[PDB]
Amino acid sequence: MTRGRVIQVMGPVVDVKFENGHLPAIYNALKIQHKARNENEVDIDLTLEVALHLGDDTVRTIAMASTDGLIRGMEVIDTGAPISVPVGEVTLGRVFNVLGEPIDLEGDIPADARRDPIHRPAPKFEELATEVEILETGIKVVDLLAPYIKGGKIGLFGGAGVGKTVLIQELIHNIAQEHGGISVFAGVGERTREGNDLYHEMKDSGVISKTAMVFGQMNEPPGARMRVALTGLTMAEYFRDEQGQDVLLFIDNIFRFTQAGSEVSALLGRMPSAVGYQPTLATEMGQLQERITSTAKGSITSIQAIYVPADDYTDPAPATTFSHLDATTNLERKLAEMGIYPAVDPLASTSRALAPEIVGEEHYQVARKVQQTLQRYKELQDIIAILGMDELSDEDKLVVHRARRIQFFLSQNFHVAEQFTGQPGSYVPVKETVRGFKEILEGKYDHLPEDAFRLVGRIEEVVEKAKAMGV
Amino acid sequence: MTRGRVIQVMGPVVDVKFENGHLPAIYNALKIQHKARNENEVDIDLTLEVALHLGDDTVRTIAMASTDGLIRGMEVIDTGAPISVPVGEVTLGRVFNVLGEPIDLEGDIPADARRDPIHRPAPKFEELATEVEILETGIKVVDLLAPYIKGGKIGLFGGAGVGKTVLIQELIHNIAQEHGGISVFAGVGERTREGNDLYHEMKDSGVISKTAMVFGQMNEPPGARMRVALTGLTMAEYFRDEQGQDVLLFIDNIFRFTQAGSEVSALLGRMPSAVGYQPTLATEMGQLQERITSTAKGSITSIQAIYVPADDYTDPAPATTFSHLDATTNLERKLAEMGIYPAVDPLASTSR
Amino acid sequence: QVSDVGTVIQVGDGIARAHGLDNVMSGELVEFANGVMGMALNLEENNVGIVILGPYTGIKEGDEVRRTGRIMEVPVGEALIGRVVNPLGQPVDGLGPVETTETRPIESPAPGVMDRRSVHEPLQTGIKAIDALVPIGRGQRELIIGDRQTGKTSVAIDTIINQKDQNMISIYVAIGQKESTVRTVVETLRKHGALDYTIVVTASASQPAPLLFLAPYAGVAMGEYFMYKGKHVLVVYDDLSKQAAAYRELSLLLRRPPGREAYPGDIFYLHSRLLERAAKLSDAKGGGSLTALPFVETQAGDISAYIPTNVISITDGQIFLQSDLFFSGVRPAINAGLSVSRVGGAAQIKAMKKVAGTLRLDLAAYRELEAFAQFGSDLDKATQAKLARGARTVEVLKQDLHQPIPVEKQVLIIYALTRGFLDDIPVEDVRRFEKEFYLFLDQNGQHLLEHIRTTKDLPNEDDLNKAIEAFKKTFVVS
Amino acid sequence: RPIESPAPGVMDRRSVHEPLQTGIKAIDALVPIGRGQRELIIGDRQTGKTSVAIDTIINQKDQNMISIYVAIGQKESTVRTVVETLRKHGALDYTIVVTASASQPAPLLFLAPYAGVAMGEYFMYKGKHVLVVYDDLSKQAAAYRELSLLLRRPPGREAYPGDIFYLHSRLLERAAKLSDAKGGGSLTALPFVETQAGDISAYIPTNVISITDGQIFLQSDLFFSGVRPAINAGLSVSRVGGAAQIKAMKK
Ligand SMILES: O=P([O-])([O-])O
């Protein structure tokens, strides 16, 4: 027979014993359906995933929901296949959970719909593409110091309470409304209020007609938090694999996946790692990251947000994900506290597209000059903090004078922040910002006060702000 | 039955095996008395305290003295109750150890005196006073700049050569003269010569007639060093529970209590904590600090000294101790040199 | 018999192990022969792990354990209002038993994505600084963070007291506090007459860690019953650091590998599962609401610590208090740089929106100009005018404890301050001036107060200015 | 007599009132040492700590004292040279030497100080005065740690067992000044502690400082300059000091 019994319950981990010679394979799905016999029992409907083989016809599994009410000796049914999620044109405009069940209260999906397994191997070496081109976003810092790549990987690093949600919402508003393709959103391990607001905004804007969403949000157990991302990826891959259409993807927070993995690995019997993580941290992340690539059939562009615990950039989880990205942006609490938004570090951020033959000689020279001036200004902080500005030479004073103006001009005002301040916001082209930075570097605007460069947008508005102030 | 025999000896940890269905309860006390039968044995007199139930009719205990000379198979008897300490008028002007036996060369207490257990739950919510009142000490600086609250905890910061003993004696004398109360002094793990000097300074001043003293030496096991505060507190509680009067309590050092608890936890073998301390530091501190309260017919207030190791105020032990304090007093060597007594700093001291 | 009876094998440190109980289920409640309750965590092949929810000194090897047939539950009812109970729901005040007919489980799923709604209603706390700079709406999660000796309990007491005239139910949870302080808090709440609509849940510092571990969950379970009937509830947690420490101690006692700062990996989920239960329900579910105000304690003013960052990454904002400012006699020592409200702003009434911007600008200008006050005031008179305005605003923002101020009076006084009517008044007389202005408004500004209360909008500026000048005529400059 | 004996009681002691002369001007003027007091000497490796002990042993020629020297973890050639120079200066008429080289097994290194104090107590209880010097305690602590680890006992901070403080206090609490009824004898100890790179925040130094009544600091930089001894007066302290000096020196 293909039915087992429950042996041990240890929270999110359940043990099942099967008949000899009929053990299920790894990554299969098991179903438990029980009805109460008397007043001291509760109805149960739950699913499990196979993880390890312990020998003696024993299987170690992981639960996808709360395990309260389980009793030793219950019956288990084996399906013989991994988790399957419906995919196709039906998924457009709907909201799904970890198991592919709609939660939008718009009806059910017919049982004849095509569905695909979640687990699959990575694409081969010879099927990849390496074309590079620049994608424009409309933000001065990103467009100048770390251009994005169409069809690559982009990651955002930041701490707690630094302003990542505003930045990602601004990116969605600027890019998603004119992509002209297919968009997929994942909400792994984040707030429910943000998801509800995003859903209502999409409904109001009408973009929801060509997108799908899988949330699996913060309150869900680690079993679901480890599979939401895989469900979203297997939903996204079908379009570019069977139609060759351009796909744009978002991931809400990838750190919660590794956090849930570390939480689960403790009860499986593995020895702790250096900082208490699982021993298999690298391979588990690599298997997922290597699956998001652009091939000859189609291209996929993705934007990911990564959480930095306790503002420590040397933590293993943030440190091991740097080798998978192409362009990175870093947020700093020190810059955030000074009133500079979106508080992007100009020296830590890097990109692969910053080349003379890709962007342009003038842009390359301007960026290099700005970085050099910023570094030279940074080198004088120790002397400035103690001995003041009096002991500096003539060149250092001018360097500081222009560095302050550049640092203040690097800020910008967004459309989303209008509801809190009343300022409409602006959209700045690459040529405009390059010309403005070149003019600033040339020393044309050395007579204006530094307070006129804050949240101004284009260069021409600086003059009108100064004359409104009274200069 | 209430009879068992030792199966394992290793350091200050002793395991005893009993019969099934007659295991002693946790925190009980055990006695071992044995006389040498041959020339290859040594007389033994030792006391144990139950800590855990390991199963299979085995009990793990901690020793209160040296364990040299123990032999596997030696019989053990059970008292059926935790450590008992005599209370009443007989304890005034006396010196006792952790077990309650007198140290002074003035005889022993008769065996028919009343004795009370060491471990006791905290008073209930219904018995607490609903109003806050100020205790009067008769010292201008304290009464004006840092008032004391009945049932509160006061932390004292200072060093050698400033007048801590003089201030303590003055407080005891004033309280005894005016409010009619008494005082109890408990020293946890301090220097024997300093203790003797303090004893002589109390003796030749006439204050010793209205106080009781409990001492715990440095050369004692951590289990013995961990219960001195408890025995002093249970000595003090009797007067407010029965007579109904205000009582003073003094603790020489509180850091030694936490370090002894950490050593005991390490000996038992539990996994360490944040900075190597015991996992139960907060609850161990609370179980001792929650019994010093003010009831509807009495109150107990305590003056405590803190060490603040490594001059770090974010250390977990000072952080946990600071959460129970209600006032702070400081002593200034500059004022002592200038000649102002009691050289209490008027700006550093704060009170709630 | 092994079906529903078991025997104890090992006892120690509040953790016990039993043999038997074949039909027991995970999360069920068990009862010892001594009468102490317990919870079953692990269902192993040969034994069951049990956590003791009480004094464990009375339990010995060989005792009898029997089932109860119910998942962990607490009694909930309307009769619970005005009582003081433990996390298990037993009365502690000694005023007799409590009768209830309904119970709710401790662990319950949170409302879904489609069941929520945007926050659009205000919550008045009675504190001028908070109500002006950091508005709080119904259904919002707001964090209060600061060092010790900052008077965090006073803010909670005042905001609980201020809800007398509004349809709100308050629940106060104390974790790891002192029984004398809890008694004094209950006494002053009774004196101010706030016991008619409040429930107090207590857990002393001498109680075991398992009892210290369930108080917030019990509070949320009690509040959900009123939340789901269409009412509004307010829940305050005294300290989450104590709960975190208790959970860390229990996990260490269970021999699990620790992580950063000896904390387990479940610490983030522990707080998320609790704080995710506060939401504003939609119109299709009755329109109820629930709000929470957790407290966090920091060491040496360090805001970049593990637990503070974990709590910040969940809530919708934070309020920071400074001990250095608190030492100067200012009770609401609110730092305006690190305190930000996100959900708020859309819940404020129209009167406060018209006035808050200029006050914020003046306060920011004064704070940024304070750095040069050592040798300042000799600059241009335009710069010199900033110092007087900043000092006057700082004097206005002060408040006395246990004295909430009505929102209309706050609007009027802030309008008077921002319109420059106080430029000719000495700094030392601002408090007496505002008290006399409140008295004059009560005596004569009845029509203006009624118009404000009825329309949520400012009255006509001509009449407002003439009334202000009429009052100012009779004021003594002293 | 057995090596493990109880310490004298609290009521059998008398306050220290008799000075001990070492013959070193800095020690005799700034940090006085009295009979019955036991004091810690701490420093780095190249500070010449052995010279102070040799000089203070030599200076007791005509003061009616008995000296015991205990060597723990030292080199046999160095011990031989010390014995030879002591014989040359004639100090072997009233001294006893106990040695335990680094090649010996750990239990001997662990047990030597108890044998030394057991030998001293016999002369102490007859009404005489005894001086005992311990060469190193960190090596004894390391040997005890090695034995406990080899015996499979649970470790603590820095892999040390849970009773290292008890082990040190039990040994250091046996020095006292007896009363008139007990005979009036006395015993004093001068334990040594060696630090690495000049830190004093380590576990064993903190434990020893929390027990002793004072410490004497030796400066590596001052020794490198050429000052003998390189005593640092800014950190040295003597709690018993003042009451253990003659009137002339006190004035
Ligand atoms: O604040 P956030 O959103 O977490 O960045």
Residue numbers in the entry:
A (entry chain F): 1 to 471
B (entry chain E): 1 to 352
C (entry chain B): 24 to 501
D (entry chain A): 127 to 377
Paste lines from the article:
First, we prepared a cryo grid of nucleotide-depleted wt-F0F1 (ND-wt-F0F1) in the absence or presence of 4 mM ATPγS. We reconstructed three rotational states (state 1: 3.1 Å, state 2: 3.0 Å, and state 3: 3.7 Å resolutions) from the single-particle images of ND-wt-F0F1. In the structure of ND-wt-F0F1, the C-terminal helix of the ε subunit (ε-CT) also adopts the up form and penetrates the cavity of the α3β3 cylinder. In contrast to the previous structure of wt-F0F1 (12), no nucleotide density was observed at the noncatalytic nucleotide-binding site in the three α subunits or the catalytic site in βTP. Instead, a density likely corresponding to a phosphate was observed at the catalytic site of βTP. This phosphate was possibly derived from the phosphate buffer used for nucleotide depletion. Therefore, the structure indicates that the closed structure of βTP is stabilized by the penetration of ε-CT into the cavity between αDP and βTP, which is independent of nucleotide binding to βTP. In other words, the penetration of extended ε-CT into the α3β3 cavity does not result in the open conformation of βDP but rather forces open βTP without bound nucleotides to the closed conformation. The structures of nucleotide-depleted F0F1 indicate that the ε subunit directly forces βTP to adopt a closed form independent of the nucleotide binding to βTP.
F0F1 consists of a hydrophilic F1 domain responsible for ATP hydrolysis or synthesis and a hydrophobic F0 domain housing proton translocation across the membranes. ATP hydrolysis/synthesis in F1 is coupled to proton flow in F0 through the rotation of a common shaft. F0F1 from the thermophilic bacteria Geobacillus stearothermophilus is one of the best characterized ATP synthases because of its structural stability and simple subunit structure (α3β3γ1ε1δ1a1b2c10). The γε rotor in the F1 domain (α3β3γ1δ1ε1) is surrounded by a cylinder composed of three noncatalytic α and three catalytic β subunits arranged alternately.
